[PDB]
Amino acid sequence: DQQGYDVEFDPPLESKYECPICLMGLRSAVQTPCGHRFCDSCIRKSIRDTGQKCPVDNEVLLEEQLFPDNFAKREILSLTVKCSNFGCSEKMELRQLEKHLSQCRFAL
Amino acid sequence: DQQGYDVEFDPPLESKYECPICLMGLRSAVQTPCGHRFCDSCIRKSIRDTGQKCPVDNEVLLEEQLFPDNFAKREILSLTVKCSNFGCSEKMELRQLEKHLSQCRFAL
Amino acid sequence: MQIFVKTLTGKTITLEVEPSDTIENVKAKIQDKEGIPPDQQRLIFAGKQLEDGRTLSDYNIQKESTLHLVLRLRGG
Amino acid sequence: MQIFVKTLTGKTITLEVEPSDTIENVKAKIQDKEGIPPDQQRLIFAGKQLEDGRTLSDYNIQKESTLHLVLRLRGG
Amino acid sequence: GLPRRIIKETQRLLAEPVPGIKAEPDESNARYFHVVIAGPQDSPFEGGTFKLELFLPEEYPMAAPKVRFMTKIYHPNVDKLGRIKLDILTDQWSPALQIRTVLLSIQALLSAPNPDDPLANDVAEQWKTNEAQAIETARAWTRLYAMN
Amino acid sequence: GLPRRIIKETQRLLAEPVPGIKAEPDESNARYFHVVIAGPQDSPFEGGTFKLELFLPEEYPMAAPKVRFMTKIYHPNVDKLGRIKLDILTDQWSPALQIRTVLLSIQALLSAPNPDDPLANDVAEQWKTNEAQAIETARAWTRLYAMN
Ligand SMILES: [Zn+2]
Ligand SMILES: [Zn+2]
Ligand SMILES: [Zn+2]
Ligand SMILES: [Zn+2]
Ligand SMILES: [Zn+2]
Ligand SMILES: [Zn+2]
């Protein structure tokens, strides 16, 4: 169910902070032994459905071998983003989005 | 004995790729559970000499809890650097430095 | 307004706050960037240790004023 | 010269090579950036699978020519 | 409301198209794709335009997309119904792979036919026994069925 | 050939100085530092300039630097020989910490004296029993020993 962070980044989201599976910002980032980043849910879905291997190069990858890239997470959460609601022009850090989305004046 | 990568980066080395212990490029980068980067040797020296804790915030840190930030390593090795020898003006990726330093025309 | 915060390593970061913000509020913003819990931080300005209770307007921290970060200070 | 290489995700990277470089040489440079071993890579240009033996000058890959990356292709 | 990978993956593919390959989604169903792969250079199919139909299943990207030719083609790895014997679709798939890469692999398959792992057995037999005949047959099949 | 952290850490500190605190290395020994901390605002030491001597040991940064005052100062956490009762130096050190941060902590210690964890016992006793007297004593000790 849970994918990555879906919002227009400003400047646009760099590929290094992008998930190969959902093509969005890395929600709860995790890094492999071979050494690339995925969301927590997405890579575990690729293991559970598609098989115990790293999507991009077919290297060996168990579910336990993953670890959280908390350095990457702190960087991503501080990136500036635009309000996802139609009409709103305001900007903020990604960490402050969920707070503002309740406070936003344009939501349905 | 072994510290980080000691060379003039161009553009200058960003703090996110810098080791807090040696103040240089992260040689064989490793990330903690609390989530910041060190060299392989430097953090293990801080554990062995100074104690089982993360230098920057005194969080709990065993020697086994570390893991290699191979994503960070690949980024650092592709950063452009200048020749460390006195007089040489040529530039290259960090990965190609050791090869060129034997081939360099200015070394003592 | 902006405020400069010099970290343990020597690197600087810039936060966005108003003078009404507490020192506990600023330490919570420094936690978000660097990943250091607020109780572990000790902030210095003009050679004065800034304590959790007061605000930035009390110590008189203005636009582009440089703070300094120090580790936990307990027993001597 | 420069050459564009479109990765699996859609992101592009730009390498530095000469026409004398082999396909094995270019796959080794793509390993350095992305962390994909050379045997696992399959490069496409003008709808033609580029094999390890030949060079870039044989296939006629010029300045700012866009290659494409594909995963390992074994059995059908 | 479609899965929001597909909505991005459509936009990237449509905004930055691949040279030779046209691709657009069906107006009544975003999971169906009107594909038209042009015939590659220095092959049996030099100067042809072949239709295809690509479908994204329910559990995409964890399941591979189903692709079939919508044009008659004399090729050992493509059967007379249009279904393709390509490795991306019949095993060893990963969610990292995209629509863009599948169409590139199908484009690459036309330049490199492999009778040793066949699907159309009469075509694969023809290719091994008399190769120059089968290439001329495929060149005629291009002119009859795949030029306009 | 010194350890190359110290050579960078000297350059950073010298190029970007701290307001109030002067610091330079000794010309014959790079491990010794001529420090001169200015007295902080709204304290007993308002408008003074105190010398210090900072030394970097062999296994720095894994061992903390040894610091001592080179000026007479009426302070409960500083003894009559000049050695300092500050927490960075007497325990719980980490190699992340630098010379810059040590001098900032010593600067901060002057504005906030703590008799409850003392070193100079006569000064710490004087501070608790008669605080306003001890502050005026320290103000005189600044004027005698620490103004030029
Ligand atoms: Zn994801
Ligand atoms: Zn991998
Ligand atoms: Zn809004
Ligand atoms: Zn280091
Ligand atoms: Zn930490
Ligand atoms: Zn050189």
Author numbering:
A (entry chain A), B (entry chain A): 53 to 160
C (entry chain C), D (entry chain C): 1 to 76
E (entry chain B), F (entry chain B): 3 to 150
Manuscript excerpt for this entry:
One E3 ligase with a critical role in many immune signalling pathways is TNF receptor-associated factor 6 (TRAF6). TRAF6 preferentially builds Lys63-linked ubiquitin chains by virtue of its interaction with the Ubc13-Uev1A (also called Ube2N-Ube2V1) E2 complex following engagement of receptors. To identify the essential features that regulate ubiquitin chain assembly by TRAF6 we have determined structures of the RING and ZF domains of TRAF6 bound to the Ubc13~Ub conjugate in two crystal forms at 3.4 and 3.9 Å. Both structures show that the Ubc13~Ub conjugate contacts both protomers of the TRAF6 dimer.
We therefore expressed and purified a truncated construct that contained the RING and just ZF1 of D. rerio TRAF6 (denoted DrRZ1). RZ1 and RZ3 had a comparable level of activity suggesting that the shorter construct contains the key determinants of activity. TRAF6 RZ1 formed a stable complex with Ubc13~Ub that allowed purification and crystallisation of the complex. The structure was solved at 3.4 Å and contains two 1:1 DrRZ1-Ubc13~Ub complexes in the asymmetric unit. Each DrRZ1-Ubc13~Ub conjugate complex sits on a twofold axis and as a result the crystal contains two distinct symmetrical complexes, which have a centrally positioned TRAF6 RING dimer associated with two Ubc13~Ub conjugates. The α-carbons of the two symmetrical RZ1 complexes overlay with an RMSD of 0.4 Å, and both are similar to the RZ3 complex, with an RMSD of 0.9 and 1.5 Å. The contacts between proteins are very similar in all TRAF6 complexes and provide a molecular basis for understanding TRAF6 function. In the TRAF6-Ubc13~Ub complex, there are close contacts between ubiquitin and two Arg residues in the linker-helix and ZF1 of the interacting protomer. The sidechain of Arg126 from the linker-helix sits at the RING dimer interface and contacts Gly87 of the interacting RING domain, as well as the main chain of Lys33 at the base of the α-helix in ubiquitin. Whereas, Arg147 from ZF1 packs against Asp32 of ubiquitin.
